[PDB]
A paper describes a structure:
However, in Xanthomonas campestris and some other bacteria, these reactions are catalyzed by a single bifunctional N-acetylglutamate synthase/kinase (NAGS/K), which has been proposed to have evolved from the fusion of ancestral NAGK and N-acetyltransferase. We have now succeeded in solving the structures of two NAGS/K enzymes, from Maricaulus maris (mmNAGS/K) and X. campestris (xcNAGS/K) that have substantially higher sequence similarity to vertebrate NAGS. Each mmNAGS/K subunit has two domains, the AAK domain (residues 1–290) and the NAT domain (residues 292–441) connected by a hinge residue, Gly291.
We have previously shown that xcNAGS/K has both NAGS and NAGK activity and that its NAGS activity, but not NAGK activity, is inhibited completely by 1 mM L-arginine. Crystals of xcNAGS/K diffracted anisotropically and had high solvent content (75%). The molecular replacement solution with the mmNAGS/K subunit structure as the search model confirmed these conclusions and assignment to space group P6222. Thus, xcNAGS/K and mmNAGS/K appear to exist primarily as tetramers in solution.
Residue numbers in the entry:
A (entry chain A), B (entry chain A), C (entry chain A), D (entry chain A): 10 to 447
Write the structure that this text describes.
Amino acid sequence: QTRQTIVRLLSSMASAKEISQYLKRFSQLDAKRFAVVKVGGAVLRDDLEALTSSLSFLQEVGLTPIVLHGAGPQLDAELSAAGIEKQTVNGLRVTSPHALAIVRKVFQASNLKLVEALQQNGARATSITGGVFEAEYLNRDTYGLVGEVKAVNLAPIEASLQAGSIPVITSLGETPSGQILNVNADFAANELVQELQPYKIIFLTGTGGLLDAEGKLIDSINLSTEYDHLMQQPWINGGMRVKIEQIKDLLDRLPLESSVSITRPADLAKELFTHKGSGTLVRRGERVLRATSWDELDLPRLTSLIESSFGRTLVPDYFSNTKLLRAYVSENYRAAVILTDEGMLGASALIYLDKFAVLDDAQGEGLGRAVWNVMREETPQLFWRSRHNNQVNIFYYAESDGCIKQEKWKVFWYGLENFEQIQHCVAHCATRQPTLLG
Amino acid sequence: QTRQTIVRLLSSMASAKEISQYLKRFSQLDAKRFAVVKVGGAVLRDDLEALTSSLSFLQEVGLTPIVLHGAGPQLDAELSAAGIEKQTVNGLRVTSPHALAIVRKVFQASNLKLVEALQQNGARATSITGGVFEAEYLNRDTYGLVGEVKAVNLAPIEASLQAGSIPVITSLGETPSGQILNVNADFAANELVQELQPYKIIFLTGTGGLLDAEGKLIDSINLSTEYDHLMQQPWINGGMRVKIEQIKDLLDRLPLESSVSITRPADLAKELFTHKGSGTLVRRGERVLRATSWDELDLPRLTSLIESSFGRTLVPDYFSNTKLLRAYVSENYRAAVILTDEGMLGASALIYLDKFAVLDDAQGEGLGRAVWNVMREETPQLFWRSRHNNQVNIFYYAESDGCIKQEKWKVFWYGLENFEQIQHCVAHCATRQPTLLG
Amino acid sequence: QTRQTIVRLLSSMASAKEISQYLKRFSQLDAKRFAVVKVGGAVLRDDLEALTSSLSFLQEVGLTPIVLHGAGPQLDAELSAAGIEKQTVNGLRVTSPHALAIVRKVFQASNLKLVEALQQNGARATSITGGVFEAEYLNRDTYGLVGEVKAVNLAPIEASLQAGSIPVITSLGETPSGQILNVNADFAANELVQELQPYKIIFLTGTGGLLDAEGKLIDSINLSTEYDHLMQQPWINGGMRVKIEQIKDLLDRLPLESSVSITRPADLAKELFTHKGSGTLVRRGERVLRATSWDELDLPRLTSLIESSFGRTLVPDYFSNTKLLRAYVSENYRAAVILTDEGMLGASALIYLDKFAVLDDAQGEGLGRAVWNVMREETPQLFWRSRHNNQVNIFYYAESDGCIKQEKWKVFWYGLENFEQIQHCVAHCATRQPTLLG
Amino acid sequence: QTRQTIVRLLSSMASAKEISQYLKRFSQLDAKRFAVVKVGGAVLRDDLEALTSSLSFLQEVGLTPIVLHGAGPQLDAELSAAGIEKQTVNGLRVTSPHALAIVRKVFQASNLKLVEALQQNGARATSITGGVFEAEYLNRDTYGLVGEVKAVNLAPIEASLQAGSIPVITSLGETPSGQILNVNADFAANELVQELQPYKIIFLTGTGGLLDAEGKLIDSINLSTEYDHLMQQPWINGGMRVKIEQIKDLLDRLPLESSVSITRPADLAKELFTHKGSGTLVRRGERVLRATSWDELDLPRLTSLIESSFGRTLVPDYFSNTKLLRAYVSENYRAAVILTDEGMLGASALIYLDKFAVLDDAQGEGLGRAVWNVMREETPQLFWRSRHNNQVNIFYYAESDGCIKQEKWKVFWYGLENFEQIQHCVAHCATRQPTLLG
């Protein structure tokens, strides 16, 4: 029903090809196994009309947020009123008896505060407060009543998602013999999700997402590639690292098509239905290897890779003819760029995009985006050809630095070349390239 | 809406007067404060289609059962599989660590099993499993992990009854600092109800209700009166006593109009909408005093008691004329029978029902029934008069041992008198009684 | 679902036996084939909050009124504003071209006015305005544009009752080739109902029902019997006759269990769920024959009639022993009273009710009521016996003029006999009757 | 609710800017005043699963199709079975008495057939069959029983759209005095719509939309402009003309933002939510005038036209400096293109797009599209400049024949120029244009 049209809004527009695909490879597959919108107390306390106005939205079309709050700003206040709010021994905290006592009530209180504001706003939330997390206890006196979420029981939650309501769950434990000690909210979600196997999975926070050296919303990450030129580059202060590592911890644990998405609530919709939103997307992508030699490849794969990505198959024996400069391939072999040397003087002088090869089940996960992204950082001057009826021309027009058309082919180049230095090399790629498919 | 007609089905029939009243004195007054249908594991395990088919019924018209299971037959099995099912030190039980462990899972399991079978059957149940009962712990090693329900938190439940679903709750505790030890299911409900303030309040059991010496369903009890000629009479074996005392414990704690009702599930409807059903009703009634002297009474009360129970007020100065044999009055002064001596030879010989005086807000709680019940055990020969348009004539026709009509009065007598011994005394009450209102 | 409890409210009370039966012999059987609540413009114009608040009620539980208005008081005004409101040639009316013109708009207007006030009040009405009644035309100039409803098309209506809404229909015709001339609203409903085959079928009117010589709501009629001592007795002024004949016209055309019911709207519920309400019920009953001779009967029928109405069968050869005074039987043989002569002096002197024999599928249609009704107009002194566990004792207690009990039998008599003249004959029936079953 | 996200799916993509606007200028404004999806018997008869599966869709989100069938293929068969299916005197038809008779039944039949298949598929249709169209009669014997829809009564329809169901209406008349003669389905809708004032308004047909000389789906028309080079050009066979004129008749009668849309049913969604679909869109646009002289304009308008279409206002006194070659403006002054001559040799040689000026409330009606469309048919060689953050760059990239970027400006040209003939003139527009805003 919905998808019938979600894709219709899609098809006729730009980033449609890559999103509609996201709606075909996951449509139908449990309800609970939709989002897993883990929130937080700073966002509860502050903006709730919009946190719940957006949670409505999904659950009122079909996609049933299986929320996971953890109210801590307010807790941290209600706790120090009587006192004992000091000491955080390790990277985490500490809690005493007359103290869980205070959390469990604040967890309770604001938990209910949510589940109601949904029901009030028109929703159907259903408080789920305990019994889900097997919180074995890490240390007894050196921390007291805190514990590492040893397992998870989904029954309590599969009930509410069999009914059809937003399982508003909690950062609380519960040993074996039933003692309820504290757990890390984050080491928590890693584990719920592992159990549930989501598709989407948003991390609401009161901020706006991840930042960069500049301080601009970095609308993506793609670990298997972008991981290093990040995890080693210093505008990655402190806990942002850990915010990153953790989300990384996760997705290795999901399929491939998953994807975190730390956004803001007002935006939540924008984020979960747009190749945009306003929250750092963040996949796991795949391992990508660069090949200088056309011999360290599974060419045959590339055949079912260019037979599946392109209409026909490659004009026979093309592979023994290919002179190969620089090759880019996804461990899985669902994406390839073949970089051939093409020009006149010598064997040079221009570097040329002979093939792009993404499989349907991919330009959706943004693979077509990660593989290409990884050569336009190696190779800075770039000239290619794409027909007129090609889908992914608009991707190109993005990258393209300039473009020129012909009823038979469209041509794109990539790089700055002085006024007189351009025309010369631009007329080239539109002269050697007419003769590549000859 | 419903009451508009519940009373229409009512008005035109027999026990209608006393039930429709029950629907006018309690209509509108919270939702949660409807039933409190505490069940049990022997009824869960065995007949659930009907336990849930009846729970539907209410919650699907408006009256929202706020259920309270406690699965124990099945627990008692799942527990001994691994073992440690022996020892019950005091009138209650005992439990260990690797042991709550087993209950909490069985409580959980069958709790969910319910909440689902409602949602499946069309209902709207909503699991509520923990955090409600403040189970302080009674003894540490001499029993281990069991506790007396020190308080109750209604939030967890007022949520689901603000939504509109059947709060399917649990016999489980939870100290202060959050350790979940065992509680008595029964000492439990006493305390939920105290907090909630129900109106109806049914105790489902797999049996059929309370029995008697014979072994016939004793469709009532009324403690303040029937208490003794019960609580001292020996067909009250063992725990039946305690089943009684406990229900007694309760209602002292409610308004007056409340009322337990131990029935079976298939019957549940019959019970909660009929002056019948098939479950021992059981109120608290009121304290009733017998008066031999027309001077140890608040006559004035009786005036607003006969001015409110009868159209007019008593023909002035009737009270200084009354010669009084035997008087029956409810501590509250909402019910009276005045027993006057009426006859010819001497001042005797027949004993005569001069007045019955029940206030609207009463023949509903069955006061008209308890006060009269308490003289037809003192006074065995009984002759009275009631007009033709009187409501409560059908009560009479019940009691009445015989009856005779006159366009101006209807006459009833009560007792066995030989063939020739009747006619003689029967013609009497229809000769001295025409001249009482003269 | 509903019946599960409608009968529970029932069973425990008085007129329950005869009404619950009405709910078992018709439960399940189309939706449209429920009511057919034909209203009228004087009730529309005046009280609509209650006409629609009651129509809601049914259609919002399941029973879907298939309403049939006919607004005429208001029409009769809106018509004379421009004029031409004079002439009513025959027992009916007359209409011209620039004139239907005015009705069709007023029919339209108030038709819509209803269908909306239902949707506003929470209902689900659905305007149905035309195309249903095949109104062939009776006379062309001598009346103009009026016609006799030659047939009916149910499609337009079975649509809205397949959806589940109150088919708010109309007193309008429509020749063959589609010209919309006027029809009698009443000759209309006769014909809809014929087509539809209702069960209940109420005639709302702004009055309160049918009256009597006195002027008291005559809560019944039963044509096949009560027809004559009515249709010939002069407090039957004018059109009341026709109101009667017409309803008579109908039911001959339905099953037996049907039944008109001219009530008021505020009462509608009371009427359609109580052996009461406030509207002249009115069946067709059956043809009843009086038999003076126990030989002009199908005794065998009476065997399956007393074998089905009573537990066992009649003590063998009882039929050749019966000395028969006066016999009452329903053409169908679903009801009998056997009147035997019983006494001492001679073969006289008391007349005695040996048998009452109603079949389940009957005391519901009120047959048990019509057959008995028809002897207590022939036979004025009446003495009978009924066990203690007998269902229909309360019917008796109604009729009974007096009653007396015995753990084995209950005894009833019928008639006024002076103080000393009673006891004598009353001791009798409780002396010859102990020895009838001997 | 919906729009909150319909626009979110939108914003991030291509044709979003022009469609989301369509959702902001019409959001909130009656319900009935949504679509007016007039269908037809060839589409009913043939594909109904999809005609109703799409009608669902709208009415089940909020947008309530107020359908308008007219079943004729099937009629034309069911009519000739008995016969009299011959003669069509004028451009229309003819019908007799024993003949409407046959339509009214077929209209009825298939009308109901629809209203049910909606209710079956999950919808909420509600048959409306008559009383809506005031069909005065055009000629009595020379055609018989056919008529021109003199007016319309919306009551019958505003009822069902106050309830919230799909008013499935009909091609039938009804004189004044209520005779139901035939009407043209098409001259019908013109008149319903006039009364209702739709926004969208689709014409389903079993075909696929309008065609061209080639025979390709002509995804648009825009009368005030494209009217002539159409209405005079001969691949406009016969009734296609009339199909056109008629839709033209209409929209002159609506606001501006309206728009027919002859599509197919399976596509209906695609059409009514995409700048695409598969049905000839078709507006009325506005009257556009070409100006050769910068003096026959309301420049001041252009100021609030370039002050509203562009951030600031025009650099003061720009208007007395403008040397103007060719000007394009919409009668209303919501759209302008200013064509200035720009080059080196002489005052020539290139023609240059100095300004595009569309008002928000416009590029939605596709004005930005019609005005520009009307110069790229006059002026064939075209060179312009647009910043990087400009919204409408993707429109451009469409038109653009080639493009080149600079962090400060983006440059586009339009036309074929030989290999050596391009570079020369292409370097130009990227040399004279850097100095236009200087």
